[PDB]
Amino acid sequence: MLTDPIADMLTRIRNATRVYKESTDVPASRFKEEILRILAREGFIKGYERVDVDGKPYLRVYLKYGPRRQGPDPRPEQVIHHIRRISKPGRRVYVGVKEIPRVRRGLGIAILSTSKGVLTDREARKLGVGGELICEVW
Amino acid sequence: GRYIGPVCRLCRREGVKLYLKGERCYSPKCAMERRPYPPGQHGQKRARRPSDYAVRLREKQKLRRIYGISERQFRNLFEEASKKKGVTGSVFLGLLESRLDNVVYRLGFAVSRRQARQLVRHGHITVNGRRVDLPSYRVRPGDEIAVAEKSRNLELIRQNLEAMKGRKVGPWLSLDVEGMKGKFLRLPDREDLALPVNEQLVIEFYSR
Amino acid sequence: PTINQLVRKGREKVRKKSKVPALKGAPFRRGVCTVVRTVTPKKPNSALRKVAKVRLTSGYEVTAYIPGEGHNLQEHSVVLIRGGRVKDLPGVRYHIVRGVYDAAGVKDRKKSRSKYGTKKPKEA
Amino acid sequence: PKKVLTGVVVSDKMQKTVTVLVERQFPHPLYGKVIKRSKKYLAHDPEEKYKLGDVVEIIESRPISKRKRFRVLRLVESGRMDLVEKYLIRRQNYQSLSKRGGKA
Amino acid sequence: MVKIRLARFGSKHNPHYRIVVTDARRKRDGKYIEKIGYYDPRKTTPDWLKVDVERARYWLSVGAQPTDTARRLLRQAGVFRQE
Amino acid sequence: RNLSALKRHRQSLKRRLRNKAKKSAIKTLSKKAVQLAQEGKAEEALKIMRKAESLIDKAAKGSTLHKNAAARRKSRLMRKVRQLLEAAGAPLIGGGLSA
RNA sequence: GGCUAAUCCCCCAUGUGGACCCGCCCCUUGGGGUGUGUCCAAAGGGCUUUGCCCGCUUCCGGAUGGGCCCGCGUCCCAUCAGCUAGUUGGUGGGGUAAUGGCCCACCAAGGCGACGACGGGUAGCCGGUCUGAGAGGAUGGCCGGCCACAGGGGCACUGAGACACGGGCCCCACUCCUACGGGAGGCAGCAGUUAGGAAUCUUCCGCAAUGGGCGCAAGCCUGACGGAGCGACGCCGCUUGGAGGAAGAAGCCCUUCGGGGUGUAAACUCCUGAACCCGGGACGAAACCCCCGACGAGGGGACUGACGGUACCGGGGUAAUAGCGCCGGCCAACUCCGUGCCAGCAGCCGCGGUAAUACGGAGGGCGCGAGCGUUACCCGGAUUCACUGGGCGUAAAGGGCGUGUAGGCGGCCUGGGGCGUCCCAUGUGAAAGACCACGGCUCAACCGUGGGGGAGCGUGGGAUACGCUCAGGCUAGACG
RNA sequence: UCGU
Ligand SMILES: [K+]
Ligand SMILES: [K+]
Ligand SMILES: [K+]
Ligand SMILES: [K+]
Ligand SMILES: [K+]
Ligand SMILES: [K+]
Ligand SMILES: [K+]
Ligand SMILES: [K+]
Ligand SMILES: [K+]
Ligand SMILES: [K+]
Ligand SMILES: [K+]
Ligand SMILES: [K+]
Ligand SMILES: [K+]
Ligand SMILES: [K+]
Ligand SMILES: [K+]
Ligand SMILES: [K+]
Ligand SMILES: [K+]
Ligand SMILES: [Mg+2]
Ligand SMILES: [Mg+2]
Ligand SMILES: [Mg+2]
Ligand SMILES: [Mg+2]
Ligand SMILES: [Mg+2]
Ligand SMILES: [Mg+2]
Ligand SMILES: [Mg+2]
Ligand SMILES: [Mg+2]
Ligand SMILES: [Mg+2]
Ligand SMILES: [Mg+2]
Ligand SMILES: [Mg+2]
Ligand SMILES: [Mg+2]
Ligand SMILES: [Mg+2]
Ligand SMILES: [Mg+2]
Ligand SMILES: [Mg+2]
Ligand SMILES: [Mg+2]
Ligand SMILES: [Mg+2]
Ligand SMILES: [Mg+2]
Ligand SMILES: [Mg+2]
Ligand SMILES: [Mg+2]
Ligand SMILES: [Mg+2]
Ligand SMILES: [Mg+2]
Ligand SMILES: [Mg+2]
Ligand SMILES: [Mg+2]
Ligand SMILES: [Mg+2]
Ligand SMILES: [Mg+2]
Ligand SMILES: [Mg+2]
Ligand SMILES: [Mg+2]
Ligand SMILES: [Mg+2]
Ligand SMILES: [Mg+2]
Ligand SMILES: [Mg+2]
Ligand SMILES: [Mg+2]
Ligand SMILES: [Mg+2]
Ligand SMILES: [Mg+2]
Ligand SMILES: [Mg+2]
Ligand SMILES: [Mg+2]
Ligand SMILES: [Mg+2]
Ligand SMILES: [Mg+2]
Ligand SMILES: [Mg+2]
Ligand SMILES: [Mg+2]
Ligand SMILES: [Mg+2]
Ligand SMILES: [Mg+2]
Ligand SMILES: [Mg+2]
Ligand SMILES: [Mg+2]
Ligand SMILES: [Mg+2]
Ligand SMILES: [Mg+2]
Ligand SMILES: [Mg+2]
Ligand SMILES: [Mg+2]
Ligand SMILES: [Mg+2]
Ligand SMILES: [Mg+2]
Ligand SMILES: [Mg+2]
Ligand SMILES: [Mg+2]
Ligand SMILES: [Mg+2]
Ligand SMILES: [Mg+2]
Ligand SMILES: [Mg+2]
Ligand SMILES: [Mg+2]
Ligand SMILES: [Mg+2]
Ligand SMILES: [Mg+2]
Ligand SMILES: [Mg+2]
Ligand SMILES: [Mg+2]
Ligand SMILES: [Mg+2]
Ligand SMILES: [Mg+2]
Ligand SMILES: [Mg+2]
Ligand SMILES: [Mg+2]
Ligand SMILES: [Mg+2]
Ligand SMILES: [Zn+2]
């Protein structure tokens, strides 16, 4: 049993990107899908699609990267440089609208989960609501 | 206890010329002509690359030795500036530049800032028609700095205000030489002042 | 430590141990001399330092350094301790204040005079 | 408003009085993680009307005795010793940590 | 009884009182019930006396007993002027 | 020395006496009626209960009992009497009780 | 022992009304209405004395003040792990303004604890204060709020209120008077003395102002307060000069012996003019009172200033205190002589053993300046107890291993509830302080007015993604 | 042997 699937996903993604995989599957959950949406919408990942593996529901997340580079180590820049779990089972993190953080002077984002649904730090602020600060991404 | 001691020796230590006598610090005698080097038995010896601290410290000493203020009052102003809204560097120079004794010097009512100081302490100066004997009194825009009638006929005030005939005055100021009046138009901008001081180094000095 | 662990035990605020048990945590303590020996320095120094056993008003018996060129401290000399260890003599953690009570001030002292307690010479 | 709390009856061994264990949840003042804390209350029960496992609503009331300032405002749900048992075991747990100790 | 009096707030030689509504038994500069005015004995400014007359009227309507000097000032602001 | 306001002490003793004495009567009469009521003697138990009622109120006329101390007394008194008369009583003199 | 007045005490009456018992109704813990029975009132005084004033009695309400109760929060040690008999609850009673083991009688056998009981240590708590980027740490003097105490302990009396700092009683310790029987005391009020201590002030002026007590008022009391005194203890302001001019020193004291430095610096020339038994001189103070009016609203009127002859204005007018620390690196400022592991320095690293920028002195220099240093203590730097924000192969740190109790944590789908969480509105968040603005004192410190923010909690309304819970389902974990 |  995974201990915290959201973390598991953020990490499958962190890992897969570090070796520049084209995509990566993660056990499917409405919730994880919700997060993927923002990820795609914000353009950190090409996209994602539901796919069964061994007859079980996963989410093929399609990674995205920058262009090949110069000098030694022609490895591309990551689109998802960062990406960390904030709230966690056994240290849940909640915030009010006035406490939503401004990830990377705006160049980054934060994904909260509100009773209005999973939103980015700008959306949540827009609809004036707060909630569980799920993660950070830049 | 505003210092009080040999002055055309601070300029020597400060490398740059500090006009702390007004007159003479112009003639071929300000020493900065013959002996621009620091004072003392080692003033001519080979210089040793100053430390970051040294640079900042000397710069603070320069800017402050110009207005002849205490480190106490000097610091008080700087703190007040950090607190005010607006680039500390300038704001600070503005406040410095708003001391009555200073303004009395800018209007030429006196040769030096030191002389201008005594002129305030001795009541020869008037803000808006009322006497003000506080060298640190802060002049605000619109205030008219003048010379007490009773002082108007003073030998010094004559030679002085005479020497100001057809003489230029800072853009943020303005003086009617005849009536011996003057107005503080507005706070000088960094651009309005041109002191041998990089006030940024000063802000840094008070950040250590 | 896990957060649960921190909730369970939390961090321990570290306490501070005084170097000057001059009790009453006063700035100075008054005392009287007993011995008025001399001690050999340690580590790599060598000299005959003037020290003093002092019965403090704080019901304490301690060795206090006697700074300055020379002194006049006897056995029943009343003194004022000011706290300050002497890096060379382990066991000495307080200085005697020249200029107070029986402790005379250093005579012919012309520089760091406020210390050693010596009035200003009537230069003329 | 008079306070109203909800808890489980963990004691019935008193005449006209039941012990109500009330639970409370909240983020830790410095470490954040939500932590469960609780307190036992001695609510007043004139008709011996309530028994163990009973989840009741306690209401702030005029003192009925020393150590007893609440009345049983009503039953929320009947029988359920999952809670009583829990309480009891934690209590039985104590029957250990000392000089002797059980085996649990 | 509850009173309407002065509370010292200025400085040495620089008095400034507050027209206050407090229980007779409290310190004078103690904790009042409500501020309803202020007074500058030396009129160092044109605004050396203000009094929320509506409020002054309230307290008097329920038993507030003004000091003589308190009453004097209140009157000066027409608290009683029925004219 | 000599703080003339020891006259207060002086006076308190006189008052102490006054109060002290009024209460004794009250207690004594009450017990008396409660005693009669119990023994079933109704007409006189009430008669006295009535005196006690009066004495109590008067005690509260000034600063002896005042407050609701009077009320408690009369209450507990009219309480015990009416009840003790549950021995075939039948409020004969229908004194203070309003049956 | 005797006499005597009253707004002293008591009796009878009147009963608006109110208290109590019982019944009924409405409300819902002892709230309110109602009926019968019962019980309960009072004080007089003053006159511009035939109506006004001060006051008295009962009741309902207001206002202010307060008691008691409850949720949550409040230091260290677990080398304190079990605690408890009025102890937990009940019934009846007592007691109180009132709830309550508050206390008592009887009955029951309970209550509390690892979410830290019990015990030990320490400590008044708060608004705030200091520090910090913040989170936090530290702290609670002055000022405002609350609590507690009045030589130590116990107790009640009188009162609307006390278990009463300048009231009372007893026990104790101590001082004092004593004809030895016995009495008298309580500065943790202002000031002052003494002791202790490194250390903390005048046996001051005034009641003029603000405020308090009593009085119809005049007014009386007020060490509260308003002021002055002493102390660089703190903060702010200010002065020891300004402008012009390089003798130039037996000796202090540098050198290549050419000179360099102190230095425009200079009891030496011109200007202003801190101080200064010199003239005038305050706001704070206009009420209570009196008269007219109607003892109202209004309107006129005597009176009264400690601070103080102070501030401040005007005149005259002297050139008129500078000190302390430091100069090896950190850290701004270097040379000579003396000394020779000595004398000594020293925050840490270190310096002195014959060329010492580190010791002491001198010249010079740096820093700050009516101050400058030192010691002590607090926060910082210290992400060096790490929540923000740390670690454990070899640096300190994985428990010798397991089993499993409490606890912490919990896969995928749906539904209910809406505890956590989030949003809205609202109440609360005293004043002071802090921040911003304007303003008063010549500035400032200081002060005045106004403005803004605000977590936490209460109330009402709402949301449901996540966490929780209840219900159902699944099979990817687990087990068979 | 001690301090460089
Ligand atoms: K046990
Ligand atoms: K009746
Ligand atoms: K009332
Ligand atoms: K009330
Ligand atoms: K209350
Ligand atoms: K009872
Ligand atoms: K602060
Ligand atoms: K605090
Ligand atoms: K504290
Ligand atoms: K009165
Ligand atoms: K003058
Ligand atoms: K001179
Ligand atoms: K030599
Ligand atoms: K030297
Ligand atoms: K520290
Ligand atoms: K080990
Ligand atoms: K072991
Ligand atoms: Mg976090
Ligand atoms: Mg600024
Ligand atoms: Mg050595
Ligand atoms: Mg030290
Ligand atoms: Mg030294
Ligand atoms: Mg039962
Ligand atoms: Mg009397
Ligand atoms: Mg009897
Ligand atoms: Mg007699
Ligand atoms: Mg009477
Ligand atoms: Mg009637
Ligand atoms: Mg009657
Ligand atoms: Mg009459
Ligand atoms: Mg009872
Ligand atoms: Mg009762
Ligand atoms: Mg009472
Ligand atoms: Mg008890
Ligand atoms: Mg204590
Ligand atoms: Mg920090
Ligand atoms: Mg700060
Ligand atoms: Mg206080
Ligand atoms: Mg005492
Ligand atoms: Mg006592
Ligand atoms: Mg009483
Ligand atoms: Mg008393
Ligand atoms: Mg008391
Ligand atoms: Mg006393
Ligand atoms: Mg005293
Ligand atoms: Mg002494
Ligand atoms: Mg007075
Ligand atoms: Mg008065
Ligand atoms: Mg000063
Ligand atoms: Mg010379
Ligand atoms: Mg000169
Ligand atoms: Mg002259
Ligand atoms: Mg006037
Ligand atoms: Mg008339
Ligand atoms: Mg009038
Ligand atoms: Mg008067
Ligand atoms: Mg003149
Ligand atoms: Mg240096
Ligand atoms: Mg020697
Ligand atoms: Mg040498
Ligand atoms: Mg030296
Ligand atoms: Mg820290
Ligand atoms: Mg951490
Ligand atoms: Mg570490
Ligand atoms: Mg090892
Ligand atoms: Mg190791
Ligand atoms: Mg191992
Ligand atoms: Mg388990
Ligand atoms: Mg779950
Ligand atoms: Mg669970
Ligand atoms: Mg659900
Ligand atoms: Mg909810
Ligand atoms: Mg709020
Ligand atoms: Mg406030
Ligand atoms: Mg101003
Ligand atoms: Mg101002
Ligand atoms: Mg304000
Ligand atoms: Mg709500
Ligand atoms: Mg819903
Ligand atoms: Mg739901
Ligand atoms: Mg299920
Ligand atoms: Mg050696
Ligand atoms: Zn110059």
From Swiss-Prot, chain A:
The keyword Disulfide bond does not apply. GO terms for cellular component: ribonucleoprotein complex; ribosome. InterPro entries: Ribosomal_uS8 (IPR000630), Ribosomal_uS8_CS (IPR047863), Ribosomal_uS8_sf (IPR035987). One of its GO terms (biological process) is translation. Keywords: Ribonucleoprotein, Ribosomal protein, RNA-binding, rRNA-binding. One of its GO terms (molecular function) is rRNA binding. It comes from the Bacteria. Part of the 30S ribosomal subunit. Contacts proteins S2, S5 and S12. NCBIfam families: PRK00136.1. Belongs to the universal ribosomal protein uS8 family. One of the primary rRNA binding proteins, it binds directly to 16S rRNA where it helps nucleate assembly of the platform of the 30S subunit central domain. The combined cluster of proteins S8, S12 and S17 appears to hold together the shoulder and platform of the 30S subunit. This is Small ribosomal subunit protein uS8. The gene is rpsH.
Curated annotation (Swiss-Prot), chain B:
Zn(2+) binds at C8, C11, C25, C30. One of its GO terms (cellular component) is small ribosomal subunit. Keywords: Metal-binding, Ribonucleoprotein, Ribosomal protein, RNA-binding, rRNA-binding, Zinc. GO terms for molecular function: metal ion binding; rRNA binding; structural constituent of ribosome. It comes from the Bacteria. SMART domains: Ribosomal_S4, S4. InterPro entries: Ribosomal_uS4, Ribosomal_uS4_bac-type, Ribosomal_uS4_CS, Ribosomal_uS4_N, S4_RNA-bd, S4_RNA-bd_sf. Binds 1 zinc ion per subunit. In a number of structures (e.g. 4Y4O, 5FDV) a 4Fe-4S cluster is seen in place of the zinc cofactor. Residues 98-160 form the S4 RNA-binding domain. GO terms for biological process: ribosomal small subunit biogenesis; translation. Its cofactor is Zn(2+); [4Fe-4S] cluster. Belongs to the universal ribosomal protein uS4 family. Part of the 30S ribosomal subunit. Contacts protein S5. The interaction surface between S4 and S5 is involved in control of translational fidelity. HAMAP family: Ribosomal_uS4_B (MF_01306_B). This is Small ribosomal subunit protein uS4. It comes from Thermus thermophilus (strain ATCC 27634 / DSM 579 / HB8). The gene is rpsD.
From Swiss-Prot, chain D:
It holds the Pfam family Ribosomal_S17. Disulfide bonds: none annotated. It comes from the Bacteria. Keywords: Ribonucleoprotein, Ribosomal protein, RNA-binding, rRNA-binding. The keyword Nucleus does not apply. One of its GO terms (cellular component) is cytosolic small ribosomal subunit. The keyword rRNA-binding applies. GO terms for molecular function: rRNA binding; structural constituent of ribosome. One of its GO terms (biological process) is translation. Disruption phenotype: Increased generation time and a temperature-sensitive phenotype. Part of the 30S ribosomal subunit. Contacts protein S12. HAMAP family: Ribosomal_uS17_B (MF_01345_B). Belongs to the universal ribosomal protein uS17 family. NCBIfam families: PRK05610.1, uS17_bact. One of the primary rRNA binding proteins, it binds directly to 16S rRNA where it helps nucleate assembly of the platform and body of the 30S subunit by bringing together and stabilizing interactions between several different RNA helices. The combined cluster of proteins S8, S12 and S17 appears to hold together the shoulder and platform of the 30S subunit. This is Small ribosomal subunit protein uS17.
UniProtKB/Swiss-Prot annotation, chain E:
Signal peptide: none annotated. Keywords: Ribonucleoprotein, Ribosomal protein. One of its GO terms (biological process) is translation. Transmembrane segments: none annotated. Disulfide bonds: none annotated. The keyword Transcription regulation does not apply. One of its GO terms (molecular function) is structural constituent of ribosome. GO terms for cellular component: cytoplasm; small ribosomal subunit. HAMAP family: Ribosomal_bS16. Part of the 30S ribosomal subunit. Belongs to the bacterial ribosomal protein bS16 family. Binds to the lower part of the body of the 30S subunit, where it stabilizes two of its domains. This is Small ribosomal subunit protein bS16. It comes from Thermus thermophilus (strain ATCC 27634 / DSM 579 / HB8).
